[PDB]
Amino acid sequence: HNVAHYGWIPFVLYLGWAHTSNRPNFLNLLSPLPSV
Amino acid sequence: HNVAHYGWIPFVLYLGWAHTSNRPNFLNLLSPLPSV
Amino acid sequence: GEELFTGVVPILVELDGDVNGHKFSVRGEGEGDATNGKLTLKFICTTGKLPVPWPTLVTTFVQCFSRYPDHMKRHDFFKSAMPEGYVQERTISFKDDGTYKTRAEVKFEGDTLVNRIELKGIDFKEDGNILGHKLEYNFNSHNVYITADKQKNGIKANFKIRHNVEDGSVQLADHYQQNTPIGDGPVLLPDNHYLSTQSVLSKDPNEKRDHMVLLEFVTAAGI
Amino acid sequence: EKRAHQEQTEKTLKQAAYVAAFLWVSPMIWHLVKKQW
Amino acid sequence: EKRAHQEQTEKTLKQAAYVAAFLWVSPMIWHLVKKQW
Amino acid sequence: SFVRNAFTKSGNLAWTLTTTALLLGVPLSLSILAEQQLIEMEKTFDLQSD
Amino acid sequence: SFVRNAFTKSGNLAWTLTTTALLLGVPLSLSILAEQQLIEMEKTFDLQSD
Amino acid sequence: HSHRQSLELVNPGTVENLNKEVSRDVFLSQYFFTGLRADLNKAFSMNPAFQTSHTFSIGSQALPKYAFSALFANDNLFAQGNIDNDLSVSGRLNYGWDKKNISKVNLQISDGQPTMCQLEQDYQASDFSVNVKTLNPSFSEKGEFTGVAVASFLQSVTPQLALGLETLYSRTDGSAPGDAGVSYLTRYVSKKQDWIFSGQLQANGALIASLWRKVAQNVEAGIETTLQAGMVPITTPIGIQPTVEGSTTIGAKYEYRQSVYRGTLDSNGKVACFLERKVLPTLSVLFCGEIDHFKNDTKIGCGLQFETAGNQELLMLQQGLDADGNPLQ
Amino acid sequence: HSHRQSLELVNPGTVENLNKEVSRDVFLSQYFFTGLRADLNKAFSMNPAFQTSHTFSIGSQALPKYAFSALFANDNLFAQGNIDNDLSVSGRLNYGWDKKNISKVNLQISDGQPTMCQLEQDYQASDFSVNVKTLNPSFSEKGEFTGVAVASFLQSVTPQLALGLETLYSRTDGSAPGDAGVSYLTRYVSKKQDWIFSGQLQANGALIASLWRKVAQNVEAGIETTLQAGMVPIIGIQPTVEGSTTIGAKYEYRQSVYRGTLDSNGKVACFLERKVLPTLSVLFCGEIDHFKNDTKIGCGLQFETAGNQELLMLQQGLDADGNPLQ
Amino acid sequence: FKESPLYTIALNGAFFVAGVAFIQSPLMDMLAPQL
Amino acid sequence: FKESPLYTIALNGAFFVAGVAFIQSPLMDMLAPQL
């Protein structure tokens, strides 16, 4: 679990990315401003 | 100023009670609830 | 808080400690003054012979009596936590010998001051400097350095002492003190200041057993 | 003294399993209560 | 020693009163400046 | 005397009940008057519709 | 390395500016939204007039 | 075998959700903070929750300084990953084999402390719910497993009341045999669904009894007790003596469409309040305050819960509008 | 004395009100607390102006636990009593012999503390303002007196600019000679009265320099600096002047008043008073100190009520007949 | 005057019984507003 | 990089002149909302 200090968050981010019809980039995915 | 530890506030309370048109009682004067 | 206790308060000290399996217990009855920053302390040993000398016992054996002027009353901590209780833990590192690790709580039990001190001295050599009894009956003025740490809102003391050896040398030892108040009332965080203290050591000729008489004057400057 | 505490907790687990089976058949006991009176 | 400090504070108060008198006449002085240039 | 200590504990209990009712009631009154403002805004919207 | 510590101090400065802008802005945004609500109330009153 | 299905019994709730109406819906135990607590959240999708969540906090020992939580739900798998400041990652994966059967594994690395894991399998039926969890599981060199294992079973013995039990086994040091404790749970649900009662005689004697009452459509109110029992020595001490610490809390919750109120009175003189006013459909300000009358102290924390989207139609759906711009029914 | 009336000089403000535009209208020195602050005030009359106030507070070392207050002002005599918890009584008393001359007294009796007194003669003229006050006066046994006595002269050199000095004499114990310090005050006011400047070279070298700017009809902003010149020893002494720069902005609206300050020490603060009712206003103040990474947040309410019927209708914005006012 | 563990559980039981009578009454329905 | 009390008064003076330029600008007027 040496990956797991940085690893579970991009896995659930990829799981959110795979089930979104907008399909945004990581700059839109991390930053808390609303953007379409 | 032996009376003034208890007495400056009733002096200004009498000064305010003398100059009001309603001229209320002391229960209405001390309590912060609105009452005409 | 302690502004009504500016006069003489009777001081009882309870010191229990072990140094390489040796049991000693020193107790004493004395008074300290705050309006004039002085202390009249007469300490009487009950056990008898002292395994550790009296210069290594004085800093552990009541800094709430400092003569304070009107310009530094805001930067005083020791009148805010003393009624609640004032627990201090010290790390005194002696050069080329062991270390002093003591737990002391300075709180008002009843009306008199009761100082429950629990000391532990580890890694000491008997043929060194402290345990060979080469310390004379004298003390040097020491400028206690006080800085405030906001992680646990307490007082940390980092200062050094000068102990006089009989053969003509000096001892360099540094204090690492952590002070923890008990109560959660009005606490004051001061700036960096120092206590300009001085101490006089004399002996009472009208006493039979092993006794220690200390005279301490505490003054404050810096802010 | 450890083995007596271990078999004490084993009897506690056995009593927990017996009272779990008792709470499983209890609906039928309350149906038998509703059959009477 | 204290008398020199006391007369220094008295001279500070006297020069403060003199510069307060200067600040009283200063608008008139500005009028003389604005009459010039 | 005992009357002064009874006044002391009555004043502490009156302060305790006053700031307890104030802390427990002022955001409750904020929520209640926000509901009254929203209900009267919906009433004026229904009067615009009717 | 040094890039990680530069990322850490940039993250600390970004958090500092974010919580400073949040604490300054969100009561100011609440006041601005209350002013927009009162301005909309006055404008609906003027639309009731006209 | 015959009349167990003939009653048509109601499935009770989970043992973790036994006091959910009292402790979570009404009370202020899970909802209190100190200092500013900004909680910026943005949901990318509606069917998949995909809720990104930034949290900024100061002045709270429990709350992290920065907390980034990504939550994905596809209606059969639930995943939450929260990276706290100091690189502490806490991820929970709840997978459902059925709607009845849900298995949840929670991991937390703390980056300088031991990793804390919880493995749970939860089963529901027509009449009974069995939850088996282990907190910090490990396997020893021997057959015994070091860790805490809690298995709890609750069955509706009547339609109104459900009775159940909970077994805790603790194997912390490994060399000693573990300690086992049985708790008894009781949930009386009214036939009008007005007031429920949740009693719980715990393993350590903590008699937690709670009542929840829904007086209207917008206000609920509850009251719990704690009654934790334990033997405390008096002033080496001479001996021990049982001194049960008891505390009774009574709270209310006002659920309006623009604001949420939660207000508790405590036995210790701990008066607490919590208002979440949704002053925008997006941004909702919350204030929580606590006055501890026993120590004459207070703790007041304000904050906001920002809520936005990452697509156009959920951005309009948060504002009550369609993607064309028409307001919804 | 001929052209002095011919210049038609504006009377400047008082020396206490030199930084009123900056340090009281905009900044957060005297608009801040911690913990809950309930301020239950009811008026009784507006032209006799009789207010009775209550103050419930916790979590602040500056605010008392409960403070009852009584304020009476008939626009020639001002009076204010303030009894705190454990009977600490404060009394302010102004009297106006003219509208320019005002004699103020202040008493602080705290039941165990020594009594603090302040006496103040204030005078305004067409061009200058003289304010002389004493903090804690005491009649010494000799021909002098012990306490603090400041005097302050401020004369408008131009219509735009006013210059003054404040002299502080301090006699703490009487036997020592009193310290005397001269502070030079500067106030440049614009001809459109939009931005003002207030510089103040203090007795201890504390150069308090402030600038106030009213950008619109609802928002002001002001920035001040303080350079305290002091000697701190490190055997030897060393002059170490501590500098602090504050910059804030006040947004004043009909519903809400907001004040936001940034500091040079990172001590970011914010104060919002939102009037949910015309009677009742909820105030919140927060402060993140980034230098020590610690925060302080205090909420509260200011409730305003009346003791008569027409003031109860007048505080709600209505008439006594039930109609709203214009 | 008795200060007991029985006093603490009697005080908690009295607070629970008085809260149940406070919470099942129509005085709590009077405490709940209609609008 | 050397730190002095002259550095502190230079930092306070630079902050004051920078604040004066920040506060007399039309960017400060843009920071004021019109409604």
mmCIF file of C-alpha atoms in Angstrom, chain B residues 11-25:
data_model
loop_
_atom_site.group_PDB
_atom_site.id
_atom_site.type_symbol
_atom_site.label_atom_id
_atom_site.label_comp_id
_atom_site.label_asym_id
_atom_site.label_seq_id
_atom_site.Cartn_x
_atom_site.Cartn_y
_atom_site.Cartn_z
ATOM 1 C CA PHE B 11 -29.509 59.008 39.358
ATOM 2 C CA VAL B 12 -29.378 58.733 35.564
ATOM 3 C CA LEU B 13 -32.439 56.442 35.756
ATOM 4 C CA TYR B 14 -34.352 59.208 37.567
ATOM 5 C CA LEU B 15 -32.964 61.717 35.028
ATOM 6 C CA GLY B 16 -34.381 59.575 32.243
ATOM 7 C CA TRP B 17 -37.632 58.857 34.085
ATOM 8 C CA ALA B 18 -38.279 62.566 34.627
ATOM 9 C CA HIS B 19 -38.050 63.317 30.892
ATOM 10 C CA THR B 20 -40.359 60.716 29.342
ATOM 11 C CA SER B 21 -43.945 61.323 28.275
ATOM 12 C CA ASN B 22 -45.106 57.811 29.171
ATOM 13 C CA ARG B 23 -43.293 57.965 32.594
ATOM 14 C CA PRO B 24 -43.241 54.192 33.230
ATOM 15 C CA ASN B 25 -42.668 52.102 36.336
#
